[PDB]
Amino acid sequence: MRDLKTYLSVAPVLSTLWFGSLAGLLIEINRLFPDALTFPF
Amino acid sequence: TFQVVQPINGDPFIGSLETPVTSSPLIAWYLSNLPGYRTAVNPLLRGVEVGLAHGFFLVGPFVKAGPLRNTAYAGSAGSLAAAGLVVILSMCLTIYGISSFKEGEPSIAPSLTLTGRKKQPDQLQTADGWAKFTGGFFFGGISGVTWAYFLLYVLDLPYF
Amino acid sequence: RPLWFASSQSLSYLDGSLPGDYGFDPLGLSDPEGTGGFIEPRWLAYGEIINGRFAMLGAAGAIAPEILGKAGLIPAETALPWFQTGVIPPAGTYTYWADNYTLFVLEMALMGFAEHRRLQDWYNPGSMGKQYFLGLEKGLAGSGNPAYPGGPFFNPLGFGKDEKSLKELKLKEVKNGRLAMLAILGYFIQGLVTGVGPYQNLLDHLADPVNNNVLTSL
Amino acid sequence: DFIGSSTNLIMVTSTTLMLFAGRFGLAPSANRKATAGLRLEARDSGLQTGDPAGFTLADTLACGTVGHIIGVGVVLGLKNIGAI
Amino acid sequence: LVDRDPIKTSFEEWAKPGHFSRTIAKGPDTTTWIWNLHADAHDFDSHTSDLEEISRKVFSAHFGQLSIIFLWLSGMYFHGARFSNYEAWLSDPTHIGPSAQVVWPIVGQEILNGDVGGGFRGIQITSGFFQIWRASGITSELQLYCTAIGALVFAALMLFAGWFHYHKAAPKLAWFQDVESMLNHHLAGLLGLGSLSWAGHQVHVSLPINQFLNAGVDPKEIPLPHEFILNRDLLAQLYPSFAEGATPFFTLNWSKYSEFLTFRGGLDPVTGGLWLTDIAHHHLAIAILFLIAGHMYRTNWGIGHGIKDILEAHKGPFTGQGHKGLYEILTTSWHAQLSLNLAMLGSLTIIVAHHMYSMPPYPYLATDYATQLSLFTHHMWIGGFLIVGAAAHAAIFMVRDYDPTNRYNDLLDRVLRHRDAIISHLNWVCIFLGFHSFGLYIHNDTMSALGRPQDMFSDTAIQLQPVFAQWIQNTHALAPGVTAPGETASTSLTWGGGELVAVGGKVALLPIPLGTADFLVHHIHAFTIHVTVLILLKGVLFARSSRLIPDKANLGFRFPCDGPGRGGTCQVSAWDHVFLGLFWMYNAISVVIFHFSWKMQSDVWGSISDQGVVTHITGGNFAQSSITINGWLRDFLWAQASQVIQSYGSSLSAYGLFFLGAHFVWAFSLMFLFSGRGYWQELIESIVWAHNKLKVAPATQPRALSIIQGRAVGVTHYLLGGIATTWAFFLARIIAV
Ligand code: CLA
């Protein structure tokens, strides 16, 4: 549906999806590599 | 249907209302006989009466609540404080009379009764009348304080 | 016409067109102002007819195996009361050629076909006689009245040839359906408070009425 | 016996008295409305009853409920003080 | 009275924001459009003028509210079955802290999974759900899972009903205005039948299971609830009167049911709560009373009362026509009903909060101090908010729906003709109470500082005894046997009977003394409440006009000002009066909760020893230290905040973080309250300039917040920060000790 796809492009829904994916990625990254203080490579 | 509250003097466009608290015959008689509402009497006598009544009153709180209430100097200190308060009130009255009234001008009191009858304006609203009132108030207050102190701590009356 | 607890509000719309109409509507549910949803006189009449027919089927079904069991005609293992034949397994169960939950799915599928066809007839009349359905759609065209479809399938004997006779038979059907609904309510509630078969209730009452009664059962 | 007991007589009397009062205009009803001066006023309820006085089923149910309430209250009150 | 398919179900309106308004739907020229979109979301009266459509819209949203509440209940019940130690707590309620929340270990937050007993690690909860579940006879987790499933199903049903009664069959206006039928149904069915059903559940399930639990039987060996119904022998063994069945009920031999329907009063020594038989009898009586009350109003059958007839018959020589015309106002305006209901609900919530603490209705609830404190503060705050909303919507009705041409009422007209006297008298009362209540605290502070303890208002120098309340306590302590012969003990243990109840070595309840400090704090409460009432009533009464702005009704209910003329006209609308009264509501509720907390910690709660000596938490310092502001600052704020500031490195560090977070949020609100819009609009102009330089200027022109929006943001952040600070402090203090 075109009208359903239009509602998914509104600012709050897109922001929520983007930030949820971002937070998931950051949480997983910190889970894999915990307690990082310096860049060792 | 019977109604109790009425517009003031039958005029509904004046910002007041007539209620039993204001227009009861007992309350109307009681207020008209107070010394502050006797517009045909010398202001000096009304001031003397007001001063006596207020000066007799002021002794009690100062005597019973003062810092020296639990000592032998309670009554004298209370009477002295009451006299000082009476002096301050007299100063305030004198200042108000000086600032508000000007010499030579006629009275500003209303000259119409509630029923429309014409009457002489009260002389309390002039400089001379207010000065007489203030002097009488001072004299009456001092006399009342003295009388209260005499009764309380010169005659061993079984009070309380 | 006779009236039964009629009211001025009820008589304003119950003019006697429907079969078995006595003007009885104290709550005014068939009031034709602001009709909608499932509150609608036509839908209510259709539901009453369907419920009466099902209760008529169910009233005799819940008692038929019982009376022959006491009559020595069928094996006693099949002469069970309606509440123990497997409807409520905690109350008792009987082993069939398949487990109860397997029978339930087949029953649901067949009844779904039947009831969906009936509902689609109701929504758009005359529709079931158009699409090919094993060549049986010729006789499933209906008659324009949802509760009385007729046709070679539902009216094989051709009863009710005369309009007055049809009116009489409709009245008898309505009366019998109401009586069957009352009997089914009696079945349920009697089974609730006595715990034995309704035929056993009748036999106990006929044994003596003063010792087996509401005053002694409650 | 319970049938001849005082409770039976009291409750039957209460119900009968309430029904009689409702029927013969001694109490308000569907066709009788009491005003602010506690005076009954004639009214039409629009319900067919087949009764000469117009006593409908709702009036009968209300009168029965009031009679039962009064009878239960009287029975329990007399039982508490040990009178019955 | 319904309409078939009024509105088509489609996604078309989803892609066009602001469809409910003509102006908003035009497009976002500036950023004010986005803010205006949310502020007018639920103002159905502004969208359309048809009363039927507004009623239909209002009817549907309540279904969504009910669905949300059902989802919340489902979550609460599910968490207690999967992530809780309820079964372990059931075998030792006095030594195990309830917990129903666990945390994933990611960034070191697993320290919050503190030890609570029963071999469990989690966050200790203070909502009191464990006591509710115990009082209902719940033993295993399967029952909780079934309850969660049922709540989910009910939420789905509510959502479907909400969709249906708006898109398929919407009731007409004549359906909504049947107030007599609605009252009859909500009285007889919603309340009476619910009370009857709960009484039946308590009689058949809660009583035997709770008796078995109080006997000390292992919860896993207690028969299941259905075993007491199928096997009447068990109930007959527990209660011999059950062997007779329902015969005594129908023969009016109700005295046989005295074994499980009592009139005892007081608390159960084993658990510390009210007797469950008393609760069952109470619910039965309440069900009967509510069932009788639901047959008053007239319906299709003639018998009953007409609300209009009742209203039209009340008038007096002072009030003129009286209550004539009030029926039409309340059946045409949604705002007046909302205001009245909000006020009544807030008052009821405050009453419930006051009643729950002194009459503990749940087992092992009096000895759970954190739960008691949390429930009290929560319900008080909810009541205050509802009370403020009542006045807000009363002002809204006054501004919008008032029309003397077609909806004249004599009582409303007479009130508006002497509002000056009411406001002036309330002002004088507020000033007098403030002088003679707070002034006594400053006097005590000055005398203490000067070194004259004998000239203070205290129990040792100048007593101000609350003789009236002590008389009530004495009368209630002597009520049984004289004025309540059927009672065995008093309604509450706080009246001054002299008896003390101790459960598990802790003090549950005991008589509460009243002295000089209670006098002062009660008068402080009265002063604050009077000021709040003054503000709200002044806002409501002058909503349409005043001597300053004669045409205030034309400007609307929510407008910022009327210019700098007449010396200044800032915050003259009725909205600003609610904005101002929220602060005073916050002040009053904070003072009340501080009084409650200190008094209970100092004079009630404590521990008892073998010899029977009570040692309170703070040692009974409320009487001599609360009479000065320095005492409140030192012995309450400074002394009791050491728990929250020393919570770092333990399972209570979340409260320590919330303390500073709420400090920051509260301090952040002063930027919006102390400043104005012009400065921020002028500052934005410079920021926009550099964006234009780099071709990053948006087409949606940035605009500063409006005056009303700024005030709302300020008050919201202020309230949030203050309440969060108090919440963190209270929980951190009470969980540790
Ligand atoms: C039964 C309760 C009830 C109901 C049905 C209503 C209904 C209504 N109120 Mg109302 N009100 C209530 C209680 C209630 N109120 C109470 C208790 C108060 C006192 C506090 C008020 C104070 C009030 C005011 C001052 C106004 C209304 C207005 C209105 C109308 C428009 C509502 C609107 O647009 O809001 C839109 C809703 C929002 C914008 C949501 C607000 C967001 C809250 C405040 C912040 C929550 C913070 C949260 C925890 C942080 C998470 C954020 C997240 C994104 C991360 C509507 C008829 C307005 C009106 O009639 O104007 C003509 C109006 O001006 N009400």
Ligand code: CLA
């Ligand atoms: C991509 C968009 C964008 C770009 C390129 C810039 C660029 C700039 N901003 Mg800025 N700003 C933006 C969005 C943007 N802003 C937004 C949305 C806001 C409102 C929150 C602000 C608020 C803001 C202020 C208050 C100030 C600047 C300032 C500045 C300048 C100093 C550099 C800097 O880091 O400032 C710091 C930049 C920020 C603090 C902005 C926060 C980051 C935002 C949230 C990113 C959002 C991007 C947006 C979602 C794009 C979506 C892309 C998507 C459609 C694909 C620089 C030219 C400063 C200046 O020199 O004054 C002119 C200054 O004082 N900005």
Ligand SMILES: CC1=C(/C=C/C(C)=C/C=C/C(C)=C/C=C/C=C(C)/C=C/C=C(C)/C=C/C2=C(C)CCCC2(C)C)C(C)(C)CCC1
């Ligand atoms: C918790 C919860 C839940 C659940 C709930 C439930 C489960 C409920 C139930 C309920 C019920 C289950 C109810 C019932 C009821 C009943 C009734 C209400 C009845 C009545 C009756 C009557 C009233 C009668 C009467 C009578 C008389 C008077 C005379 C004659 C005889 C008789 C007996 C008939 C859920 C999941 C939702 C979720 C949330 C929470």
Ligand SMILES: CC1=C(/C=C/C(C)=C/C=C/C(C)=C/C=C/C=C(C)/C=C/C=C(C)/C=C/C2=C(C)CCCC2(C)C)C(C)(C)CCC1
């Ligand atoms: C406060 C609150 C809450 C809660 C609440 C609740 C819990 C409620 C409940 C309620 C209820 C719980 C109700 C109920 C109702 C009703 C009912 C329950 C009914 C039933 C049944 C019936 C109606 C029946 C009937 C009958 C029968 C049986 C048969 C025959 C006929 C008759 C009619 C008799 C919360 C916290 C959450 C939130 C806030 C607020």
Ligand SMILES: CC1=C(/C=C/C(C)=C/C=C\C(C)=C\C=C\C=C(C)\C=C\C=C(C)\C=C\C2=C(C)CCCC2(C)C)C(C)(C)CCC1
């Ligand atoms: C002469 C005559 C007659 C008569 C009859 C009669 C008069 C009968 C009646 C009877 C009746 C018509 C009765 C009724 C009743 C009713 C009721 C009774 C209702 C209800 C009630 C209730 C529901 C209540 C409840 C309760 C409870 C449960 C508990 C507490 C107490 C009370 C009581 C409140 C006839 C028609 C044959 C024929 C013609 C002639």
